[PDB]
Amino acid sequence: IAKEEQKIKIYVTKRRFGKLMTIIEGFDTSVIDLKELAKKLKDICACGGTVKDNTIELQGDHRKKVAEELVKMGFSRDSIEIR
Amino acid sequence: QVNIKKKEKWGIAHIYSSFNNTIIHITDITGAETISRWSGGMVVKADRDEPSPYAAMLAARRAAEEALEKGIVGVHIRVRAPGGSKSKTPGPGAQAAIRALARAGLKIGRVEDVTPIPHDGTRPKGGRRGRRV
């Protein structure tokens, strides 16, 4: 058990052939597990994806989805910005 | 030097022949004394040229000046390779070394199939559909 909260920037990005991607950045890499979070998020989006340094990337526009899934998990509605 | 009657020396040359590298290694007829060890990745700078024939002549020419330096003029060549791990068949330095000895001037006696070949089975890597391409 722990806590930790962070400022979250979500936005459309760019990958090779195929569609745009969705970046979710600004999580505390000590406390939060981007690999457990991201496995959970690829399930919600239903997209492939990775942990890209300190970010999660999700293939396609998932911007309303993810914020809606992050707030559920007990993250603050007021720390999140969809751009 | 305790008096020599023949006035000719002989140095058996082990030739270890990989598709990743070539090693040439000539010793005395006993094998208890190593004059010289020279491979194919001191000659060059890169991994791709580590084998080939051209490293496997030049490697076999630097050594060949130090065997001339001892008195070794006759050489038997013992061609061999990794057999249990990989495929027994010699790589690009086998046709290369013997060309590298006829140019160096060292005489060529016996040329020999002494490569490790198991009388038996040992499981290498690579299964289900063997090693896959």
């Binding site: - | 030097q1 305790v2 020396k9 005395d28 007829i29 006993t30 208890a32 016996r110 199939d113």
Partner: protein
């Protein structure tokens, strides 16, 4: 390392107990007395017929070194991959024939013979060609001296005597001594 060369000693091979002091073999080495058990390969140029021709590769071992002179015994024989692959054929057989020997001199000697079969009908006469080797060999070792008994086997004499008997039973071809290994030296009384 950094031999002038002058930390390099030289010895000379004199290998008897199969022939006289075969002068062949010259030994360089660094320091004194690091070769006293080191093994030398030779074709043997004593008999330039068979011992040069079909008997390529014998191992001799310097049991001692005296005044810087190497005394060398018979340690072993081994044939090259050349031999064994060449001879063998299909729809026939290749056989192999051990015997753990004891001669009257107090040496034990491990032989493996190799004969190649005459075509069809593979059977219990195969192992009986096996049996007629281990019987005849035991009896020649007990009778003959050891130094002699390592001249005969290495020569074709043994391959020849084997064939006469074994062609009565079930005719053979391409019989030989594949390899020999010195089972036990010491003596009859240690």
């Amino acid at each position: 390392t950094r031999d002038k060369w002058k930390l390099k000693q030289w010895y000379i091979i004199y290998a008897p107990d199969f022939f006289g002091g075969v002068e062949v073999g010259l030994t360089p080495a660094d320091d004194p007395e690091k070769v006293l058990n080191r093994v030398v390969e030779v074709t043997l140029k004593d008999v330039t017929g068979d011992f040069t021709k079909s008997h390529v590769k014998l191992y001799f071992q310097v049991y001692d070194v005296k005044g810087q002179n190497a005394y060398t015994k018979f340690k072993g024989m081994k044939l090259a991959r050349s031999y064994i692959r060449s001879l063998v054929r299909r729809k026939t057989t290749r056989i192999d024939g051990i015997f753990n020997i004891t001669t009257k001199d107090g040496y034990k000697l491990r032989v493996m013979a190799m004969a190649i079969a005459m075509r069809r009908i593979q059977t219990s006469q195969e192992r009986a060609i096996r049996k007629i080797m281990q019987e005849i060999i035991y009896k020649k070792a007990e009778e003959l001296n050891f130094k002699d008994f390592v001249l005969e086997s290495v020569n074709g004499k043994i391959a020849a005597e084997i064939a006469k008997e074994a062609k009565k039973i079930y005719p053979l071809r391409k019989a030989e001594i594949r390899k020999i290994k010195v089972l036990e030296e010491p003596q009859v009384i240690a």
